[PDB]
Amino acid sequence: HMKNVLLIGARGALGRAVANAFANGKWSIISVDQAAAVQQGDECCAVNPASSIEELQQAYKSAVTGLKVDAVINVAGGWAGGSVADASTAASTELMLRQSLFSSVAAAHVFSTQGEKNGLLLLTGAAAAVSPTPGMIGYGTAKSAVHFLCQSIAEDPSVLPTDASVLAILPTILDTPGNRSAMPHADRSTWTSLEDVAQQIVEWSNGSRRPASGSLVKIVTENSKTRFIV
Amino acid sequence: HMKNVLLIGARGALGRAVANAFANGKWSIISVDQAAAVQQGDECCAVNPASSIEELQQAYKSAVTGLKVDAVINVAGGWAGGSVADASTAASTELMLRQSLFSSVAAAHVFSTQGEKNGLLLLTGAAAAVSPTPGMIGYGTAKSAVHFLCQSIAEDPSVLPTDASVLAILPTILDTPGNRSAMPHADRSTWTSLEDVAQQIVEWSNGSRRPASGSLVKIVTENSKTRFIV
């Protein structure tokens, strides 16, 4: 368990896949999640969903005190729909901002100050958020902001450990319990396996060849085969 | 005073310029500002700086109850610097998000539901936020998100009144009391006059020719002359 990873969103479907892929292992895993950490048998930090970015930052700093972190992995966030015509868009956009953007700003600061040389900061965007998202204002605005944050971090590498990388993954559709439940009978040939994403995150984290720091990495599945593409 | 404008950020330097340009007039002005509304002699709604997007939305809906709004103008927001290396970036990024993005999501919903035909939704971006902003993470991420929001609104015009427009202004440098104070002796030849921006917002609001709904409008000043450019 020589290498250290801070895992944000550890209790979501993609978070559990990522924790499973770490633990090979080789890795010591420090996990955090908002509201949704069952806080029973789980060795996961529960942080309040009403947390400020500064509160997230302090909670993350605390969880890894006196560690060099090789990887900070943020795979937090769910989904909601809504246009500006919908009253519901106000709350859903704030929720998506908190889950994805607040967590990513705090996570970047911990990686900057406690990251190890050759380490990885990985954030979670959305392939759809590369374009206007009139029907998913919250989801698209939050994820677009994560993409922007990824690019801005990379633009000044002096803020990262030596030879560190930041990457954002842009999933299209993930094969999650939620999606299976929603559409039991659907053609899932374009639905990316969580194990495939998790395994790729752990290789990148281990210092396999990575796309250029700053890359938006689209996760494209056809006939149940997956490419990681810039 | 036939036409109605909801003005968000009315107590900032650009907000006062915009209120002055309305009042020609011809316009009935309903103004809102966070923390900074002096709430003495001022006919301005003071909204709490800790407001949720839904709270902003309700406060905006209340301020214009039983009006058709020809214009919703959001010129709120200040500035802070900071990279991900800075502990201060967490709080400054949340502050910029609240001032600019929270206000813009709420303002878009009020314009969708209470806007008049041929009306204007105007948001405030930043010319610099078209590119990575490693040295101003908060400011750039918040403003980039406003640009994205502007584009997403325009992408589905069924959410807006008939022949309505949304625009985002991308200032580079504004000739504000704050900037004059900071650099009394500086060459201000590239600093845009607030009166010039305000006057252009009021013409667009009145239904002058506008760039295409969705435009990011850069405000470019050289030798103290200004162009509004896409």
Automatic annotation (TrEMBL), chains A, B:
Signal peptide residue numbers: none
Listed EC numbers = 1.5.1.34
- Fetch the SUPFAM superfamilies from UniProt: NAD(P)-binding Rossmann-fold domains
Write out the entry's keywords from A to Z: NADP, Oxidoreductase, Tetrahydrobiopterin biosynthesis
UniProt xrefs under InterPro entries: NAD(P)-bd_dom_sf, Sc_DH/Rdtase_CS, SDR_fam
Q: Name one GO biological process term.
A: L-phenylalanine catabolic process
Q: Which GO terms describe its molecular function?
A: 6,7-dihydropteridine reductase activity; NADH binding; NADPH binding
Q: Which Gene Ontology CC terms are recorded?
A: cytoplasm
Cite the record's note on assembly: Homodimer.
Q: Say which family it is in.
A: Belongs to the short-chain dehydrogenases/reductases (SDR) family.
This chain belongs to the protein called Dihydropteridine reductase
Q: Which organism is it from?
A: Leishmania major
